[PDB]
Design a protein around this ligand. Structure first.
Ligand SMILES: [Zn+2]
Lengths: 48, 165
C-alpha cells in the first residue's frame, strides 16, 4: 500500500497577495484623499 | 435726501449723483411704490437695496471699510504686487488676469490689453466655487464675441458687480 500521484499545480499566489495588494490599496487611498481634499479646502465662507 | 447730498456738495462732486435735484429720487421711489400715499421701512429698504444713484456713497464706503485688511491669494499682473492687499479685480475675457485697486483707479496701461472691458470686484477673499464659476463665465464669454455691448467712455462705472457678502 503505497500510492503516489503528482497532479499538483503549484502557483505563487501568496506572494502576489502579500505584495501587490497592499500597495494598490494604499495608492487608492491616497488618490481618493487627494481628490476629496481638492474638492474641499475652502468651499465655505465663514462670515462674521 | 438733501441732508445726505450735503456731504458730496461739500467736496464738490454732487453733480455725479445727479446734483442738488432731489425730485427725481422722489419720482423713482414713488414709481417703485406705485404712488403709494406713504412709505414704510421695508419699502425703503428694498428701494435702496438696488444701488440708488444718489446713495451709492453709503454702501461703497462700508464696502471699502470691509476691504482694508483683506489679504488675497493672488498677484497683480501689472505692478507684480504679491499678495494683493485690499480690493481685487478680475478680468472676464482673459485668463489668469488680476489687478490691484491702485493699478485700477490710476490706470497703469500695460501694452497689449486695455481696461475698457467688464471686470469683477472682490472685497473678501474668494472661495473655490467663485473661482470655478469665474472660469465657466470666461469660457462662455470666449464663444460670445463680436462686441455685443461696448462702453468706451467712463461716464461713471461705480456699480461694477455685487458680492452679496
Ligand atoms: Zn497693481
Amino acid at each position: 500500500e503505497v500510492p503516489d500521484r503528482d497532479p499538483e499545480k503549484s502557483s505563487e499566489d501568496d506572494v502576489y497577495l502579500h505584495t501587490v495588494i497592499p500597495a494598490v490599496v494604499v495608492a487608492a487611498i491616497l488618490l481618493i484623499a487627494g481628490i476629496i481634499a481638492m474638492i474641499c479646502y475652502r468651499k465655505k465662507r465663514k462670515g462674521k | 435726501l438733501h441732508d445726505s447730498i450735503q456731504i458730496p456738495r461739500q467736496l464738490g462732486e454732487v453733480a455725479s449723483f445727479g446734483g442738488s435735484n432731489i425730485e427725481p429720487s422722489v419720482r423713482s421711489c414713488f414709481q417703485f411704490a406705485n404712488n403709494k400715499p406713504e412709505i414704510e421701512a421695508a419699502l425703503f429698504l428694498d428701494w435702496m437695496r438696488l444701488e440708488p444713484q444718489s446713495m451709492v456713497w453709503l454702501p461703497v464706503l462700508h464696502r471699502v471699510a470691509a476691504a482694508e485688511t483683506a489679504k488675497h491669494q493672488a498677484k497683480c499682473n501689472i505692478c507684480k504686487e504679491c499678495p494683493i492687499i485690499g480690493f481685487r479685480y478680475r478680468s472676464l475675457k482673459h485668463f489668469n488676469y488680476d489687478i490691484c485697486q491702485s493699478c485700477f483707479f490710476s490706470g497703469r496701461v500695460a501694452k497689449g490689453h486695455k481696461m475698457h472691458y467688464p471686470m469683477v470686484e472682490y472685497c473678501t477673499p474668494t472661495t473655490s466655487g467663485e473661482d470655478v464659476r469665474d472660469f465657466a463665465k470666461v469660457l462662455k464669454n470666449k464663444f460670445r464675441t463680436k462686441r455685443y455691448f461696448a462702453k468706451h467712455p467712463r461716464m461713471g462705472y461705480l456699480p461694477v458687480q455685487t458680492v452679496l457678502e
